[PDB]
Amino acid sequence: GADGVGNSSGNWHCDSQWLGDRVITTSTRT
Amino acid sequence: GADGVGNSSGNWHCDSQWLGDRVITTSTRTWALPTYNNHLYKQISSQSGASNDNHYFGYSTPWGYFDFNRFHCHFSPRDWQRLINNNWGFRPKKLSFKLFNIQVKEVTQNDGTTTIANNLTSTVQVFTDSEYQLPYVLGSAHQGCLPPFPADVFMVPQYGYLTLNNGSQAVGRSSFYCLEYFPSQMLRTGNNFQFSYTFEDVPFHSSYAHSQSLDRLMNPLIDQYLYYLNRTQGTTSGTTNQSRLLFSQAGPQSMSLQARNWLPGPCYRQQRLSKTANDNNNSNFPWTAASKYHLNGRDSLVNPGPAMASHKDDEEKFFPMHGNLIFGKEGTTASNAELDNVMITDEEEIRTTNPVATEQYGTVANNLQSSNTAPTTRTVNDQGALPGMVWQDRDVYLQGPIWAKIPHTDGHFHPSPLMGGFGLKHPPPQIMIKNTPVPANPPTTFSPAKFASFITQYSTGQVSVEIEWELQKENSKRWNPEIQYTSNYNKSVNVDFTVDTNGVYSEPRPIGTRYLTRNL
Amino acid sequence: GADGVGNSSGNWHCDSQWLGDRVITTSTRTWALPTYNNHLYKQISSQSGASNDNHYFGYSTPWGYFDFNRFHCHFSPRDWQRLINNNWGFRPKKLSFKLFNIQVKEVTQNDGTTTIANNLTSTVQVFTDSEYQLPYVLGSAHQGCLPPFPADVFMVPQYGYLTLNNGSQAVGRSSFYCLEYFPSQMLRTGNNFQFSYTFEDVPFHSSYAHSQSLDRLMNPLIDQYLYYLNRTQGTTSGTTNQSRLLFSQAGPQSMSLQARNWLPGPCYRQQRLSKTANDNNNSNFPWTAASKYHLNGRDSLVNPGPAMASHKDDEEKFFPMHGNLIFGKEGTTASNAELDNVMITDEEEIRTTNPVATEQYGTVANNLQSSNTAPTTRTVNDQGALPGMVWQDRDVYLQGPIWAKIPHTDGHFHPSPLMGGFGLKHPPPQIMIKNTPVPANPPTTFSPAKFASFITQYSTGQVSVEIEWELQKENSKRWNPEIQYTSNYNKSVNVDFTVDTNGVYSEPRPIGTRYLTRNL
Amino acid sequence: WALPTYNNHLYKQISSQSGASNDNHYFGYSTPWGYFDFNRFHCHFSPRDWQRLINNNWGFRPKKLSFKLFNIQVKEVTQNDGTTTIANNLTSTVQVFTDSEYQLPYVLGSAHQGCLPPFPADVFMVPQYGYLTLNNGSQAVGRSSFYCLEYFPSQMLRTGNNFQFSYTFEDVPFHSSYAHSQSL
Amino acid sequence: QGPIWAKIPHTDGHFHPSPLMGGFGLKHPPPQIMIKNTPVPANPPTTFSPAKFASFITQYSTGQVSVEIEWELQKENSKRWNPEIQYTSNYNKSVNVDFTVDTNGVYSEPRPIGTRYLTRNL
Ligand SMILES: Nc1ncnc2c1ncn2[C@H]1C[C@H](O)[C@@H](COP(=O)(O)O)O1
Ligand SMILES: Nc1ncnc2c1ncn2[C@H]1C[C@H](O)[C@@H](COP(=O)(O)O)O1
Ligand SMILES: Nc1ncnc2c1ncn2[C@H]1C[C@H](O)[C@@H](COP(=O)(O)O)O1
C-alpha cells in the first residue's frame, strides 16, 4: 500500500464474532 | 521515479544468496552529506616551500561522491569465507546503484542552541561520470567507502583532483573542471536516483595457490635425455690433470641443474625489515634506502611493486620494506602508530611463481673467462620482462581494493592494479552528489557582488549497491584435505569480526584469498 | 571395440605421405610394461641432508605412461629433410592414439628357471588426463619416448610427480594424487583403446633464417634526412678550438650510426666456454660461475635461457655455458661423459635478431657529464623487455621436444617453451597405463591385514600415434640457390642414421630447422 | 577383491567353549560363503570430498545404489614338491546372490572388518559369513534356526560373466552436519 | 571411518530407531551380497562310493567390485555474520602428509573426522 500524509493507512479493527464452527479474533493496539 | 513527501522512495535491500554458478551481493547503507567548500570551488596547491617530492596543484570541489571500492562493502565475513574456501576464482559482472529516502535538514544556530528542521522544498544533485571526463580519483585506497558493518553510518567524502604541475606552480596545459557544467538530476524529498552498469571482460582472480613449483615440475623418477656441463677442470685429480670438459645427463639427483622450460616472474628488489625492533640497523632509512622511482625529476615511493614473495621458508618474520599492503586496526591515529596497531599482509602463497621481494633474483655472467681471466658473477637486483616468464599477481583481502581504472596511455604491459584487483578500461563511473545551494536573505537593493550568504543545510538518505559475481568452481583431484580458513573454536574473549562492549565493529585480521590448491 | 582371443585388435600402421599443404605422420611401436612400485604408491623425498638445492618431496605411482614428445618419434630422417628444406614453417593439427594387441604374461621363478606364460583372464588399465587434474610431467626432456627406429622395442616409463616442499619436508598445502580415483578402462586380450585430440591455435615454427639484419635493413645508396650528433669537441683543432656541437646527416658511410626503428631481442648473459680444453680457466665453475635463478631461497640453473646467439662471426668454437640443448650420442654413460661423446647444438641462424649469449648487450649511460665530470659508460649484462624489440625463438631438432604445457598462472610473457617448440595451454593429455593387480594365493582364514601377496606379471602390446601437420610453403624470390641439408656423397664408413654391424640405430648429428631464407 | 575357500566347502556348527566363559556363551554356524561390505564412509568418500561435504552442508543422506561384479578370475593352486604353482581354471565358476527378502540373518552394521579399503589402490580379502542363533548357554534351543545358503537361488559366473544390482534407499532423516549456536 | 547404516530389528516396537553407533536406521537396508567359489571335485575313484565327497581341487577367486551411491544434500542457509569453524589441514611444515601413504606404501588415517562444523540455531 502507498498513500499520503493526511491519509490514514489503516482503521481500528478490534472485534470478535463466532461461526459456531470457528471463531475469528481481531485485535488492534497502539 | 516520482512520488510524494510521506512516501518512502525505496526499501532496505541488504542481503546475499548464492547460485552455485554465481553470487549476488546486495548492500544498503545510510549516508550523510555536509556542504563542502562553502558552495565554492577552491584552487589548492603545495605550501610555499614546505616540501619538494610532495609538490602539487589542483582544486577542491563543493561536490561529494560515493565509493565502495572495498570488498567488505559487499561481502560479509561469513560470505567471504564460503567464497574463499570453495572457488578457484571469481569476478564482477553487473551493478545496480540506487539513491533514496532523501531528507534535507537545515540547521540554525540561534543563541547557544543548534536547532535542526526540515527544508522540504530543497533539492540535491546527482550525476554519473560515464563519459569518463572527470579525473578518476577512485582506486587510490582513499577512505569514505561503505561501512563494513551494515548498521554503521558514514559521511560522504569530498571530491578533489590534481593536475599537471611545475613545483608549486601549474603549467598552461593544466585542466580546470567544473562539475556544474555537467547535466545533473536534482532531487526533492520523494525523488530517487537509478543507475545500472555492466563490467567488461576481466580475468578471474587467483583464489588458489599452486601445489607444484616452477623448478619442481619434472619427474622425480626418470632422468632427462638432455646434457649439461658440470665439470670444467676437476678430473681424476692427481697426475697431469689440469682441466677437462665433462658433461652429465640430468637426473633426479641433479635436480637444480636440469634443463628448464620456464622462468620466474619479474622483480624489483625491496629492502628487508624485521618485526623485531632490534634486528634492524640503528638508522632511519624508510626513504633514503627504500626502492623508489622518479618522473619529471620527482621521487615517488614504489610501494606495492611487482608481485614478489614476502619471505623465504622458515622465517615468517622478515617482511619487505612496504612490499605489501598494510591495514590499520580500528581506532589508531594516522601519525606514527605502533607495530602492534597495524596488520601486515603475508604474500607467501606465490613462492612457487614469484621471486622473493627482499632476496636477490639470481646470477649473471659479465666477462670473458679464460686461462688469463677468472669467471665473474653479478648479483642481479633488477629484472625486466623476459620471454618465458610466468608469474602470479597479488591478492585481494576482505578489506582490499576491488577495481582500478587503467590509465588511458599509448601502452600498458600487464595492466593489473598494483594494489591488487581488476584492471578496468571502463570501471564503475563516479557518482557525484551535492546539496543545492540555498540563498539566505537578499537585500531590497540590487547587488552585482558575488552571492556568498547561504542557508546552512545538510542532506541525508540511503544508498543501495547491488553487484553480481561470476564464480569459477573448484575441480581438483587432490586426495588429502586442503587448508581452509576457520575461526578459533577455543574459549575466546571477543568474537572475531564483531562489535564490542560499546558498539564498535572491528576486523581482527586481513583475509587472504588463496586457500585452495591447483597445479601448474 | 570388443573382440576375441585369437583376433588381433589392431594393425601395424606406420607410414607418412604428403599433401603439399599438410603432412600426416603415422607411427607404431611395440611397448612393454612391468609392475612398478610393487602395486604401491610410495612417498619419496630428499635424502636426510644429502643436498640443498636438490631438496624435494613427492610420490611414486604404480602407473606407467606413454610419451612421444620427440620429433623423431614421428618423422623419419628423410621426411625431416623434405620438411626442413621446403617449408617456411609448420605446426601440429590433429592426433590419434591407439592401443592394441595386448598380451599379459605372468612369470614364475620355480627352481633356477624362469617360466613365462599367458594369463588370459588378466586385464590392464588405461585412462587419459583430459581434465588436466594430474601434474603434467611431460615436456621435461625425460626419457622413455617412442624409439626413433620403428623396429626397436621400448619399456614404458613410470609415473612420478613432485609437490610443494619446505626442504626435505612438505607443507600442508601439498597435494597427494591417487590415479585409482580416476575412471579407467580395463582391457583384456582382444580389447583396444581409442583416443582423438585436437591441437589449439599455435604459431608456426621458424623453419627459416633471415637474409637481412636488424642494423643492415636500410638503403645502401641513399642517405637519411635525419641528423645525429657525432662531434662534441674535435673541431678545426689548432687555435682557440676547445669544443663545439656538430651534427651529421646519416649516410651509407655512417652505417652503424643511422637512426633506427627496432631493437634486438632480450638477453641474459651466459659464460663463454671453449671446446678446446686449454683455452679455459683452470677452475671448476659449472655452478659457481653459471647464470642461475632462485625461488623460495632455492638456486636453480638457468639452462636454456632466452634465445641468444651461440657465437659471433669467425669463431664457431665458443659455445655458451649451457646456452643450448646438448644431446648424448648412442651408448654413453649418464655420469661425466667425454666431449667427443656429446652433440652440442649451434644457434647461429638467429644472429640477425638476437644478442650473442656470451657477449654483452650494449652500452648505457649512468652520469651527468659536464665540464666537471667525464661521461661514464656501463656494460649491460642483463636486459628486460623493451617496446620495439624483435626476436626469433630457439629451434627444434629431429630429436628435440615438440610441445610444452604452459603453466596455469596469472601471467605469462611470450609463452614459448624455453627448450623449444609449441607452448600449449591444453597439450596432448597424459595417457596412463598399469597392470591390474592379481592377488596370489589367499588363506582359508580371514585376514584384515593389507594384501601384499600378488602374482608377478607384465604386459605388452602395440601402440599407434597419428599426427597431422599443417605446413607453410616457401614463397621466396631469391635468385641464387639457398642452402640445403644433405648427406655426404663421399665414400663413407657407416651410413648416416642407420643400424650398425650388430643392430643399433644411431643418430649422427643434431638437425636444425632453419635452412631457408626469408627477409625482415 | 580376493576370495579363498572358507570352511573347506563345509557348513560347521560353532559354539561356546565347554566352560570357558559365561557372558560370552553362544551358538551358531560357519558358512563356506563370503560377503561384500562397504558400511564405512571412507569406502565412498575421499578425505577431500569429506571435507567439502562437512564444511558446506546442513545435512545429508543416502539415495540410490549400484552394485557391480566383474573381471572375475578363478586361479587354482597346487603344491607339487616345495613349490606352489598357480594357474587358470577357466571352466570354473563362482556364485553370487543377494538377500533381498531379508531371510538370512543380517550380520552387517556391527562394526565388523573386511569392508572396502579407504585407499583405492589397496587390495582386500573377502570376509567369511557366520551367524548366531538363540542359545541356552553353550547349548541351543529347539527354536533355533539353521540356514543353508545353497537353498537360495544364486547366479553362477564364469570368466567373462558379471553381476548387476540396483537398490533404492528408503526415507531416512538427514544427519546433523551442524551444531547449535544456542543452548536449551 | 564410521558405520553408515543399520538394520532396525523387526520387533513389535522401537522408540527412536537410530543406530546407537551412529548413522541411518533402515527397515530395509542394502541387502547382503554373498559370494563363494563353486566346489570342484578332485579326482574320483573308478569304483562307486556312497561316502560324502571331501576331496576337492584347491582354488581361489579374484576380481573387481564396484559400488555407486547417490547422496542427497541439505545446503547451508545461515545468516551468521562472523566466520564459522572449518576443518582444515595444518599449513605448517610437516613430516608426513595427512591421509597418505608412507615411505613403504601404507595408507593411514591420522585422526577421526566429525561432521558438525557448521552452526544452526534452536
Ligand atoms: N586485471 C586485468 N585486466 C585486464 N587484463 C589483465 C588483467 N590481469 C591480467 N591481464 C592480462 C590478460 C591478457 O592476456 C593481457 C592483456 O594485456 P593488454 O595490454 O591488454 O594486451 O593482460
Ligand atoms: N608457442 C607459442 N604458443 C602461444 N603463443 C606464442 C607462442 N610463441 C609465441 N607466441 C606469441 C604469439 C602471440 O602474439 C603472443 C600471445 O601471448 P599471450 O601471453 O598469450 O597474450 O605470444
Ligand atoms: N535413522 C532413523 N531412521 C528412522 N527414523 C528416525 C531415525 N532417526 C530419527 N528418527 C525419528 C524420525 C521419526 O520422527 C521417528 C519415527 O519413529 P517410529 O518408531 O518409526 O514411529 O524416528
Q: CA B396 from chain center: how many Å? A: 8
Q: Is B173 left (phi over 0), alpha (psi -120 to 50) or beta?
A: alpha
Return the C-alpha cell found at B301: 615511493
Q: Is B156 in the pocket of ligand 1 (CB under 6 A)?
A: no
How is B440-476 classified by DSSP, letter by letter?
-PPPSS---SPP--B--EEEEEEEEEEEEEEEEE---
Beta bridge partners of C22: C470
A3 near B CB under 8 A: yes
- D56: contact with B, CB 8 A cutoff: yes
Does C89 sit in the ligand 2 pocket, CB within 6 Å? no
Residue B480, C-beta contacts closer than 8 angstroms, at least 6 positions apart = C175, C176, D47, D48, E89, E97, E98, E99, E100
Q: Quick one: DSSP state of residue C83? A: H
β C153-155/C158-162 pair status: unpaired
The SS3 call for residue D169 is coil
Radius of gyration of chain E (CA): 26
Q: How far apart are the first and last CA of chain C?
A: 52
For ligand 2, whether the C-beta of C203 sits within 6 Å is yes
Residues spanned by the domain of C338: 1-520
Q: Which three cell numbers stand for residue C61?
A: 605411482
Pairwise CA distance, residues B71 & B397, whole Å: 7
Q: How far is CA C326 from CA B226, B300, C72, C303, C347, in A?
A: 6, 47, 16, 11, 12
- SS3 of B328, please? strand
Q: Is B426 near ligand 1, meaning CB less than 6 Å away?
A: no
Bridge partners of C42, per DSSP, are C60
Query: What percent of the residues of chain B are helix, what percent strand, and what percent coil, each to the nearest 5?
Result: 5, 35, 60
Write the DSSP string, B288-319: TSS-EEEETTEEEE--S-S--BS--TTT-SEE
Nearest partner of C76 among C499, C504, C398, judged by Cα: C398
Domain count, chain C: 1
CB atoms within 10 A of CB C302: 21
| Helix (H) / strand (E) containing B382 | strand B382-383
Q: Is the CB of C202 under 6 A from ligand 2?
A: yes
Q: What are phi and psi of D171, to 5 degrees?
A: -75, 115
B340-364 per-residue burial string, b: 16 or more CB within 10 A, e: under 16: eeeebbebbbbbbbbbbbbbebbbb
Task: State the ligand closest to the CA atom of C421.
Answer: 2
Closest alpha carbon to B264 in B352, B384, B394: B352
Residue E82's closest CA among B492, B415, D183? B492
Does B85 reach chain D within 8 Å, measured CB to CB? Answer: yes
Q: Where are the alpha helices (DSSP H) in D81-149?
A: none
C467 vs C422: CA distance, rounded Å: 15
Q: Is the dihedral of CA E86, E91, E95, E99 positive or negative?
A: positive
Alpha carbon separation from E2 to C111, C285, D64, E68, E85 (Å, rounded): 47, 60, 20, 18, 22
Q: Contact B267/B308 with Cβ under 8 angstroms?
A: yes
Contact status of C47 with chain E (Cβ, < 8 Å): no
* Cross-chain Cβ contact D75/E59 below 8 Å: yes
Nearest CA to ligand 1 atom 22: B414
The three-class DSSP label of residue E12 is coil
* Residue D152 φ/ψ, nearest 5 degrees: -110, 135
Of D47, D50, D55, the CB nearest to B484: D55
Do chains B and D meet with 3 or more Cβ pairs nearer than 8 Å?
yes
Nearest to residue B471, comparing CAs of B41, B75, B69? B75
* CA B188 and chain centroid, separation: 36
The H or E element that residue E45 is part of is none
- Separation of B89 CA from ligand 1 center, angstroms? 16
Q: Sign of dihedral through CA atoms C375, C376, C382, C384?
A: negative
CA distance A6 to C197: 75
Q: What is the DSSP letter of D142?
A: T
Mutate: best of B210, B216, B390, partner C, most C CBs <10 A: B216
CA trace torsion B393, B397, B403, B406 (10° rounding): -30
- Smallest CA-to-CA distance from C371 within C239, C242, C248 is with C242
**Cβ contact E74–D94 (<8 Å):** no
B302 contact partners, CB below 8 Å, separation of at least 6: B268, B290, B291, B292, B293
- Which of helix, strand or coil describes residue B497? coil
HEC string of A1-30 equals CCCCCCCCCCCCCCEEEECCCCEEEECCCC
What residues contact A30, with CB distance under 8 A and at least 6 apart? none
- C503 three-state secondary structure: coil
Q: Can you tell me the distance from the alpha carbon of D127 to that of C442, in angstroms, rounded to the nearest whole number?
A: 12
Output the nine-digit C-alpha cell for C360.
Answer: 654483452
Show Cβ contacts of residue B391 under 8 Å, excluding neighbours closer than 6 positions.
B264, B265, B266, B306, B307, B350, B353, B354, C409, C410, C411
CA A12 to chain centre: 5
Ligand nearest to the CA of C414: 2
Q: D179 forms bridges with which residues in the sheet?
A: E119
- B36 grid coordinates: 563542502
Cα E97 from Cα E91, distance rounded (Å): 10
Give the E-state strand segments of B20-132 in sequence order.
22-33, 42-45, 57-65, 87-109, 114-118, 124-129
Which residues of D fall within a CB distance of 8 Å from E5? 39, 62, 109
- Do residues C512 and C207 make contact, with C-beta atoms less than 8 angstroms apart? no
CB C191 within 8 Å of CB D133: no
Phi, psi (deg, nearest 5) at residue D49: -55, -50
Q: D15, D113, B220: which is closest to C56 by C-alpha?
A: B220
What's the rounded Cα separation, in Å, for the pair B432 and B435?
Answer: 11
Let me know: does C263 contact C389? Beta carbons within 8 Å.
yes
The single residue listed with the C-alpha cell 646456452 is C323
Q: Any idea what the Cα angle at residue C158 is, between residues C157 and C161, rounded to 5°?
A: 130
A5 touching B (Cβ < 8 Å) = yes
Q: Is B206 on the interface with E (CB under 8 A)?
A: no
d(CA C405, CA C415): 10
The rounded distance, in Å, linking the Cα atoms of B519 and C177 is 11
CB pairs under 8 A between B and E: 60
B262 near C418, Cβ under 8 Å? Answer: yes
Q: Which residue of D has its CA nearest to C111?
A: D83
Q: Select the residue of C42, C436, C439 nearest E104 (Cβ to Cβ).
A: C42
Contact status, residue B148 vs residue B71, Cβ threshold 8 Å = no
Dist CA C457 CA C62 (whole Å): 13
Spatial distance between the Cα atoms of B403 and B420, rounded to a whole number of angstroms: 8
Residue with cell 582444515: E88
Residues C272 and C275: their CA atoms lie apart, in Å, by: 10
Q: Which amino acid is at C480?
A: N
Q: Report which of B364, B383, B410, B298 is spatially closest to residue B57, judged by C-alpha positions.
A: B298
SS3 B143: coil
Cβ B361 vs Cβ C293: under 8 Å:
yes
Q: What are the Cα distances from residue E100, in Å, to C46, C325, E109, E111? A: 17, 38, 8, 12
> In Å, what is the CA distance from C350 to each residue of B428, C213, C216, C353?
47, 10, 14, 6
CA geometry: angle C79, C80, C86, nearest 5 deg: 90
Enter the DSSP assignment of C240: S
d(CA E7, CA E31): 10
* Pick from A13, D28, D48: nearest CA to B474: D48
The CB of C396 under 6 Å from ligand 2? The reply is: no
Query: Which residue type sits at C249?
Result: Q
User: Please, are residues E6 and E25 in contact by the beta-carbon 8 Å criterion?
Assistant: yes
All three cell numbers of B485? 580458513
Method: X-ray
CA of C416 to the centre of ligand 2 (A): 7
The H or E element spanning position C24 is strand C22-33
Contacts of B376 (CB under 8 A, 6+ apart): B365, B366, B367, B369, C289
Start-to-end CA distance of chain D, whole Å, equals: 49
Q: Is B45 exposed, middle or buried (0-12, 13-18, 19+ CB in 10 A)?
A: middle
3-class secondary-structure state, position B84: helix
| Ligand 3, residues at Cβ distance < 6 Å | D 172-173; E 14, 16-18, 24-25
Angle between helices D47-56 and B77-86 (to 10 degrees): 160
Choose from C176, C185, C438 for mutation: most chain E CBs within 10 A. C176
Exposed/middle/buried for residue B182 (C-beta within 10 Å: 0-12, 13-18, 19+):
middle
Q: What is the DSSP string of E64-95?
A: EEEEEEEEEEEE------SPPP------S-BS
Give the three cell numbers for residue B232: 670444467
Nearest CA to ligand 1 atom 8: B416
Distance, CA of C514 to CA of B224 (rounded, Å): 25
Amino acid at site B81: Q
Q: Does the CB of B2 have a partner CB in chain A at under 8 Å?
A: no
The letter for the amino acid at C404 is A
Contact D121, C455 (CB under 8 A): no
d(CA B346, CA B338): 18
CATH number at residue C167: 2.170.30.10
β-sheet bridge partners, residue B493: none
Total residues found in chain E within this entry: 122
Selection from C293, C288, C318, C287 nearest residue C305 by Cα? C293
Q: Is B473 on the interface with C (CB under 8 A)?
A: no
Q: Measure Cα distances from D23 to D135, D137, D138, E20, E21 in Å.
A: 12, 9, 11, 21, 21
Cα–Cα distance for residue pair B335/A11, rounded to 1 Å: 60
First and final C-alpha spacing in chain E? 29
In terms of C-beta density within 10 A (0-12 exposed, 13-18 middle, 19 or more buried), how is residue C450 classed? Answer: middle
Q: Taking a C-beta distance cutoff of 8 angstroms, is the pair E99, B479 a contact?
A: yes
Which strand (E) or helix (H) includes residue B83?
helix B77-86
Query: Which atom belonging to ligand 2 lies closest to the Cα atom of C424?
Result: 3
Between the CA of C402 and the centroid of ligand 1 the distance, in Å, is 28
Residues 6 or more apart from C142 whose CB is under 8 A from it?
Answer: B218, B219, B222, B223, B224, B225, C67, C157
Shortest CA distance to B78 belongs to which of B395, B485, B481, B396?
B485
How far, in Å, CA of D167 to CA of B450, rounded? 89
**Which phi and psi (to 5°) does residue C411 adopt?**
-155, 145
CB-based contact C295 B354, cutoff 8 Å: yes
Can you point out the beta strands (E) in B110-251?
A: 114-118, 124-129, 153-155, 158-162, 165-166, 169-170, 185-187, 193-198, 208-210, 226-231, 246-249
CA distance B235 to C336: 10
DSSP code per residue over C207-222: -EEESS-SSS-S-SSS
Q: Tell me phi and psi for residue C83, to 5 degrees.
A: -50, -60
Instruction: Enumerate the β-bridge partners of residue C339.
Output: none
D-chain CB neighbours of C436 within 8 Å are: 71
Measured between CB atoms, does C111 come within 8 Å of chain D? yes
> Scanning the structure block, which residue is given the C-alpha cell 652433440?
C343
d(CA E38, CA E26): 32
Q: Are D184 and E40 in contact (CB under 8 A)?
A: no
Residue A2: its chain B contacts at CB < 8 A? 3, 7
CA angle E109, E113, E116 (to 5 degrees): 175
D75 DSSP β-pair partners: D88, E60
Tell me which residue of C379, C278, C164 sits closest to B213, measured CA to CA.
C164
Q: Which atom of ligand 1 is nearest to the CA of B416?
A: 1
Tell me how close the Cα of E112 comes to any Cα of chain D, in angstroms: 11
- Cβ burial of B113 (10 Å; 0-12, 13-18, 19+) is exposed
